[PDB]
Design a protein around this nucleic acid. Structure first.
Lengths: 37, 157, 219, 302, 86, 792
RNA sequence: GGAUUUGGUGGAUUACUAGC
């Protein structure tokens, strides 16, 4: 009950990071071929 | 005959040795001159000869590093030709004369740190001037220790 | 302008000094070397016995110290004192007459030990400026503007009189009180070598036996 | 010299060659003159025998230094090629479950990864009869006070491309459809890409960036959906697990702009769900490495 | 700066062109001569000081390609900068 | 453990001679001064032949079949090595200086040009057994005003044409009957002709000259023979063609100039595709592959080899070797990363897996003396003679801080706190051990107390104690952490120039000037023992010497030492010709390695026949993987290894144990026995037979069954096998089982298992995590696309 | 019978394919 919760809690905050990493790269990249000379 | 006249006073192998220094000792002044033609408040120029006087004092061709006039006036070949190894063995009173020090270098009795040195014309840095000794177990470092009655053949001196 | 021996270090590096005692010290003066160890900062007290003056000098240039403080005594009353700057620097054999050790008085506490201000009075002579620049460099550089203990070196009547004081500043006046030793002090010879050397060049030497010996000052 | 043989000579006029692992003779030499001494070289090259008659020393050249030697007990006849030539080639793959890598160098993932950054860091670094001067530039301060080439550079930049095209005018004709797109096309029609993916292994890393960028992308999206279905059919075979995911990732740098804007198309997301239904199984090494890391850090340190 | 009495070789049209068009063009060529001479000095000076043979450091326009590439090269330039520093 | 072989030479990619691609073109071979190195572009691996070449390679010949490789030295010695065999089949001696040797397309005979004489010699069959006199010469041609500067071969062996330096060019057929077809020599060429080229059609002959003007010879009617049809001219302000390589099928011309500009032309259209300057120094030898995709240009002056592809603007491999020599060798915790210092001060990081440099560091203007790595992959500290020490990152390739002294002192050597807080350095000028903190770039303290300079400095990881090295013959062990500040001094007989710290943290290995290597304790001042190294050191007589090699005191000490990570062996190397492997308990050397056999270098020969650079090893370290120890030479960084394992090193054999018996166990299903029966032979192919055989369901049963004694040995085998093998999933279940079966035992014997832990956890970081992160990154991107709303 | 010193030649001192 200690280990499985701590895995499932950190992974739930590790999912929030990379879901925000891949999106904001995609926001940065999609501007970088729309408005880049 | 200035080149011969200082080849005798320091004992040089080839009479061309002098002008092998006097090409360097002239090349100091040619770098001194063009570094004098830069304007005085230039942080290149202020950095750059003090960068050089660090080296020409470590090698020991010039007596002080304060006077900037020495760099054209006291830089002589006879200044660079007395940081030669046999002169330094005569300065440190190792050999009796200056020809006799060439006789001991060529026979192989002198060394700098680990390795013995065999060219007579080894320039020696003022920093490296600490470390010249007689080569160990030599027949000339054995005779010195017999004079003070202080041999120790566990060293096989 | 600072002296030529002290010129390379002058403000840059802190001094580290050694207070050491003569030979088999009396227990009064072995206390009194500790007041010298406390009067300076960066001072350690190494008890001396069966050291020679070569191998205590030569094992100190090696380890690297600025200078050396050695004391002497008569029957518990300390009499003499030398400061000798190590990298072939000068030495100054001082005679010190009126001493009051700190351990005599009361258990009032313990000293401040913080960096002191100094007070040099009545040094006019060029030899007097030598004694300035050879005493001043025994303290760590750049004291704070509001450090609370001040060490006066006063020169009334050719006897350099040194006292240790603390001060606080009231609404009108400064009020002070005394801690630490009272000295009278008198230099009597000044070599250019260390106290090892004993044949170095004598910059100054107190001549006693001269028709005008009592007349001049700093002579 | 390596303890692998013993050569003994005896009064039966033979010279045998014993083999210490397998415990038997592998060569039997009947010499008519009996051999008194046999000595190898300390080097692995010469064998010297001395016989009973004759004066000199017979020197034998060792074929074992230039050729592998079978280890069979052939001596009884005169008088598992894994084991016989004592070398073992590895399996390509143990079982259908096990993930593998590609055969060959381990740099093929790394070079195929950052292919755009490396090329940007590999390249080298590098009037008019009537002069035109502004009023401020000349001695007209009063005119400047009341005063109120990028396009030319861009036009000049078009000229270099035009010049290179003019420079090369080869009349040689090269097939309209490249071998890749043709092998993609037969792969899709066949519905089996097993022959397609055998080509994608043997491309150079220089070819692969030129290839996956060269994918016909349009409203219908036929080539992209054909290519994803190659990679999903790759990971079902579990071979070359390193490379096929890098072929996957190289899409998203080259066409990740495209498949994002055409997300939730039912044709692309049919492939991508078929990707994710396959790609979920290969988390089982990411759950395997962390146990392999965190124990081995705990064991050696603590 | 000291004005030079000697007649300027450059004409009025020429001086304006220079204004119309490193630290200084003359001073850099002084710096470039004087470092080529110093590396010649270190070689000969270095050979006498050194107890082992030393090769000459140097032997003294189109695209230039660096023989050795500094840093990772494959890694992006942006990665080297720290997040805190942007 | 004992038998090492020369596995690899690292650094110095190109020294001198022709660079020729293989017929397949998969592997490119570059010739070093005394050896030939083969580079495989596809596998990114560098292989060097174990054979010495007695002087520097001047020419390289590769057979079209690839069975025979011939290298010609300046003396004219001929060495033939089969690429597959990697052994010298024959060593015939030529008697003059050789310029280039090219095998014929048929390969029946190889054309060789020496001076002004052209020779064709029948090539001995590789399959045929070795003979006393294999070399035979088919013919000799002496009709040249001057020796030919280049040799070119047609597809047929009938015509061989060599371009003379006089100006004239001659054509020679192979068979005597085809002499009447072509015997004419071209004339009127200006300057000198660098090379002569033949197109697929034999009607057109292409020639090049030193001036840079190119003339094409076309046969036509004025009964009519060999006019100049058209001239082609290359314009260079000061550049002159030095070496020219032409490929007939692709019609591509490679031109080498004194300036170093690289240009490409097509013979049919005479159009310049690209002009690039590889370096300021001129290209010496340029070669082209059959495909022509890869072109290799090497400059001898800069000693750098560069390969470029004409079709796509990407370089397969571009690198430059150290200009002089590598002063220090640094080994990272990961086996693959290697750091080498240089006299120039440029720092280049080599790779253990493939002999290429990932990056260079030009931060140090002065030469770098010592390069060391702290116990992390985060940074490496480099010591230089400039008087400043700069830390470097390997994630970002940048200085953190450049640590400097007070009064600007040179720094020889260096020591880094394993917990990377403190960097210590030592001089020749000052003899004070400066101590920097890693965070604050101030120097914390100037640890002093030596007479004479500090040679080396090292920190034992277990006790975090730094031991100084002095020329005063006294070894002083410092203790610098935590309110102690106590230094313990141990007297030594002669100047100690070598200091080695054992992994244990309890012993210190020294290399004094009397030759002798002593091994001290630390917690006590006494010594365990000393081992005597003055006799088993080979010393060279230099050319300018006046003493015998027996009684010179140049090289009989050791200027480096490094303990193995087992703590049982020392590898030492100095300014001598030899490297050693002393055993530490038994106190006897194991095997002595001669670094090089070159007359070109000075310190090689004990006896000359009846200044030049000295040959000496500078710094030696044993790798964590521990297969081989790299010694940094004059010729370049050597790597010795045991990755062959062609050696029968059995352990506990019974009469019952044969290779066949282990195979029988698999049929019997006794996995526990057939693994132990295969560990008794200690042969890798029986182990791979039984390691790959047994299934997943009895891996942990086998792991529990495996004895404690074989645990260190089995872990080492997994570490070397799993790096280049395709099985990630099967290998990791073993390392789960070995760790799972005895987690406490491995942890308890931390000292016992060091190489096994490092080797296993290079496999996990380098190849296993990157497969994970690509699996991880790909999964997140798919999640982002489905979760995100559709565009427009 | 024994010991010391020395003149001269030959063979080696890199790995053996014939002279013009």
């Amino acid at each position: 009950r200690v280990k499985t919760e701590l895995r499932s809690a950190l992974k739930s905050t590790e999912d929030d990071l990379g879901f925000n990493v891949q999106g904001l790269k995609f926001v940065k990249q999609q501007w970088n071929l729309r408005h880049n000379y | 005959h200035r080149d011969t006249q200082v080849m005798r006073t320091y004992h040089i192998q080839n009479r061309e040795d002098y002008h092998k220094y006097n090409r360097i000792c002239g090349d100091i002044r040619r770098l001194a001159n063009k570094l004098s033609l830069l304007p005085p408040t230039d942080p290149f120029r202020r950095k750059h000869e003090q960068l050089l006087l660090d080296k020409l004092y470590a090698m020991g061709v010039l007596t002080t590093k304060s006077k900037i006039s020495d760099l054209e006036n006291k830089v002589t070949v006879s200044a660079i030709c007395r940081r030669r190894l046999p002169v330094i063995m005569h300065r440190l009173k190792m050999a009796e004369t200056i020809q006799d020090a060439v006789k001991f270098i060529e026979q192989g009795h002198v060394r700098v740190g680990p390795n013995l040195i065999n060219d007579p014309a080894y320039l020696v840095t003022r920093n490296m001037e600490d470390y010249v000794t007689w080569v160990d177990n030599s027949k000339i470092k054995k005779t010195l220790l017999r004079y003070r009655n202080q041999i120790d053949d566990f060293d096989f001196s | 302008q600072v002296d030529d021996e002290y010129a390379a270090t002058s403000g840059i590096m802190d001094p580290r000094i050694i207070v050491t005692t003569s030979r088999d010290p009396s227990t009064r003066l072995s206390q009194f070397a500790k007041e010298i160890k406390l009067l300076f900062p960066n001072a350690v007290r190494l008890n001396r016995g069966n050291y020679v003056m070569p191998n205590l000098v030569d094992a100190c240039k090696k380890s690297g110290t600025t200078d050396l403080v050695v004391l002497h005594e008569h029957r518990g009353v300390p009499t003499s004192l030398t400061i000798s700057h190590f990298p072939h620097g000068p030495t100054a054999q001082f005679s010190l007459h009126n001493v009051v050790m700190r351990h005599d008085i009361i258990n009032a506490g313990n000293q401040s030990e913080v960096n002191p201000h100094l007070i040099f009075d009545n040094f006019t002579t060029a030899l007097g400026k030598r004694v300035v620049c050879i005493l001043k460099h025994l303290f760590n550089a750049g004291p704070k503007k509001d450090s609370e203990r001040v060490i006066t070196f006063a020169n009334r009547g050719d006897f350099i009189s040194v006292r240790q004081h603390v001060y606080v500043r009231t609404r009108e006046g400064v009020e002070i009180a005394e801690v630490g030793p009272r000295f009278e002090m008198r230099l009597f010879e000044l070599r250019l070598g260390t106290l090892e050397n004993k044949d170095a060049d004598v910059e100054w030497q107190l001549r006693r036996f001269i028709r005008t010996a009592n007349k001049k000052d700093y002579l | 010299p390596e303890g692998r043989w013993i050569v003994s000579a005896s009064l039966d006029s033979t010279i045998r060659t014993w083999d210490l692992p397998t415990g038997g003779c592998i060569d039997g030499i009947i010499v008519d003159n009996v051999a008194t001494n046999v000595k190898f070289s300390p080097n692995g090259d010469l064998l010297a025998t001395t016989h009973v008659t004759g004066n000199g020393i017979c020197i034998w050249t060792n074929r074992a230094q230039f050729k592998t030697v079978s280890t069979r007990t052939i001596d009884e006849s005169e008088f598992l090629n894994d084991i016989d030539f004592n070398t073992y080639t590895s399996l390509e793959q143990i079982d259908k479950e096990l993930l593998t890598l590609s055969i060959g160098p381990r740099s093929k993932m790394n070079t195929l990864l950052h292919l755009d950054v490396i090329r940007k860091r590999s390249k080298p670094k590098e009037l008019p009869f009537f002069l035109q001067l502004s009023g401020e530039k000349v001695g007209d301060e009063a005119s400047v006070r009341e005063g109120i080439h990028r396009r030319d550079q861009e036009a000049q930049k078009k000229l270099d491309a035009e010049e290179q095209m003019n420079k090369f005018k080869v009349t040689g004709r090269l097939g309209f459809e490249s071998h890749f797109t043709k092998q993609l096309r037969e792969g899709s029609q066949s519905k089996d890409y097993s022959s397609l993916l055998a080509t994608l292994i043997n491309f150079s890393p220089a070819a692969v960036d030129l290839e996956i960028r060269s994918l016909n992308s349009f409203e219908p999206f036929d080539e992209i959906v054909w290519f994803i279905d190659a990679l999903t059919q790759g990971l079902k075979s579990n071979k070359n697990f390193e490379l096929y995911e890098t072929f996957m990732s190289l899409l998203f740098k080259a066409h990740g702009d495209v498949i994002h804007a055409n997300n939730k198309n039912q044709d692309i997301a049919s492939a991508l769900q078929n990707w994710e239904d396959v790609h979920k199984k290969e988390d089982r090494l990411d759950d395997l490495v962390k146990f392999c890391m965190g124990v081995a850090a705990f064991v050696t340190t603590a | 700066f000291e004005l030079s009495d000697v007649k300027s070789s450059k004409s009025l049209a020429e001086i304006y062109e220079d204004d119309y068009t490193a630290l200084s063009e003359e001073l850099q060529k002084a710096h470039s001569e004087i470092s080529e001479l110093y590396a010649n000095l270190v070689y000969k000076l270095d050979v006498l000081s050194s107890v082992h043979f030393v090769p000459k450091p140097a032997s003294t326009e189109t695209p230039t390609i660096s023989m050795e590439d500094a840093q990772p090269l494959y890694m992006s330039n942006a990665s080297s900068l720290a997040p805190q520093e942007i | 453990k004992s038998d090492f072989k020369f596995s690899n030479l690292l650094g110095t990619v190109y020294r001198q001679g022709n660079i020729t691609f293989s017929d397949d073109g998969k592997q490119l071979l570059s010739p070093v001064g005394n050896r030939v190195s083969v580079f495989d572009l596809i596998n990114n691996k560098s292989f060097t032949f174990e054979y010495e070449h007695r002087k520097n390679i001047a020419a390289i010949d590769l057979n079209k079949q690839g069975t025979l490789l011939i290298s010609i030295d300046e003396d004219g010695r001929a060495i033939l090595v089969n690429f597959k065999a990697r052994n010298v089949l024959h060593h015939f001696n030529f008697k003059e200086k050789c310029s280039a040797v090219k095998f014929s397309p048929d390969g029946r005979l190889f054309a060789l040009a020496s001076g002004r004489f052209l020779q064709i010699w029948k090539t001995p069959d590789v399959n045929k057994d070795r003979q006393f006199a294999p070399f035979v010469r088919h013919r000799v041609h002496a009709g040249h005003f001057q020796d030919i500067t280049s040799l070119t071969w047609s597809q047929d062996s009938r015509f061989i044409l060599t371009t003379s330096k006089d100006l004239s060019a001659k054509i020679w057929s192979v068979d005597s009957e085809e002499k009447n077809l072509a015997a004419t020599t071209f004339n009127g060429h200006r300057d000198y002709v660098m090379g002569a080229f033949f197109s697929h059609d034999q009607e057109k002959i292409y020639t090049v000259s030193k001036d840079g003007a190119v003339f094409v010879w076309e046969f036509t009617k004025r009964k009519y023979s060999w006019r100049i049809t058209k001239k082609h001219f290359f314009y260079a302000n000061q550049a002159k063609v030095k070496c020219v390589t032409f490929h007939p099928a692709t019609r591509l011309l490679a031109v080498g100039f004194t300036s170093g500009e690289f240009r490409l032309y097509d013979l049919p259209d005479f159009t310049l595709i690209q002009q690039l300057s590889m370096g300021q120094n001129p290209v010496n030898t340029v070669s082209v592959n059959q495909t022509g995709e890869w072109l290799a240009f090497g400059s001898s002056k800069l000693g750098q080899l560069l390969v470029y592809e004409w079709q796509s603007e990407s370089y397969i491999l571009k690198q430059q070797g150290h200009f002089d020599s590598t002063n220090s060798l640094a080994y990272s915790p990961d086996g693959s990363r290697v750091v080498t210092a240089s006299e120039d001060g440029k720092i280049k990081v080599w790779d253990i897996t493939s002999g290429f440099c990932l990056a260079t560091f030009e931060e140090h203007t002065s030469s770098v003396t010592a390069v060391q790595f702290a116990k992390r992959g985060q940074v490496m500290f480099s010591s230089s003679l400039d008087g400043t020490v700069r830390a470097w990152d390997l994630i970002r390739y940048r200085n953190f801080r450049t640590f400097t002294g007070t009064e600007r002192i040179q720094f020889n050597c260096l020591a880094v706190d394993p917990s990377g807080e403190v960097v210590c350095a030592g001089s020749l000028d000052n003899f004070d051990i400066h101590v920097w903190s890693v965070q604050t770039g101030q120097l914390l303290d100037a640890l002093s107390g030596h007479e004479g300079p500090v040679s080396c400095l090292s920190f034992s990881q277990e006790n975090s104690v730094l031991a100084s090295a002095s020329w005063d013959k006294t070894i002083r062990i410092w203790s610098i952490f935590g309110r102690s500040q106590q230094v313990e001094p141990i007297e030594v007989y002669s100047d100690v120039l070598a200091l080695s710290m054992r992994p244990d943290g309890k012993e210190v290995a020294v290399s004094t000037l009397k030759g002798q290597i002593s091994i001290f304790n630390i917690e006590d001042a006494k010594q365990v023992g000393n081992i005597d190294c003055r006799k088993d050191i080979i010393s060279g007589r230099f050319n300018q010497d006046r003493f015998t090699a027996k009684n010179s005191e140049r090289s009989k000490f050791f200027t480096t030492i490094h303990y193995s990570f087992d703590g049982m062996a020392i590898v030492a190397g100095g300014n001598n010709n030899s490297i050693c492997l002393y055993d530490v308990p038994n106190e006897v050397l194991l095997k002595r390695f001669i670094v090089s056999r070159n007359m070109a270098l000075n310190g090689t020969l004990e006896f000359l026949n009846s200044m030049r650079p000295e040959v000496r090893v500078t710094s030696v370290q044993f790798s964590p993987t521990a297969n081989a120890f790299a010694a940094a030479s004059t010729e370049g960084l050597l790597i010795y290894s045991t990755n062959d394992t062609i050696l029968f090193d059995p352990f506990d054999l019974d009469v019952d144990v044969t290779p066949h018996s282990t195979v029988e166990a698999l049929r019997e299903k006794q996995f526990l026995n057939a693994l132990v029966m295969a560990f008794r032979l200690n042969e890798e192919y029986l182990i791979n037979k039984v390691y790959e055989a047994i299934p997943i369901k009895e891996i942990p049963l086998v792991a529990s069954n495996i004895p404690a004694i074989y645990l260190p040995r089995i872990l080492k085998f997994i570490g070397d096998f799993a790096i280049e093998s395709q099985h990630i999933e099967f290998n990791l279940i073993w390392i789960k089982a070995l760790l799972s079966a005895s987690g406490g035992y491995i942890n308890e014997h931390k000292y016992l298992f060091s190489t096994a832990m490092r080797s296993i956890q290079r496999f996990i970081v380098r190849v296993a995590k990157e497969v994970v992160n690509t699996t991880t990154d790909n999964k997140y991107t798919y999640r982002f696309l489905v979760s995100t709303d559709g565009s427009m």
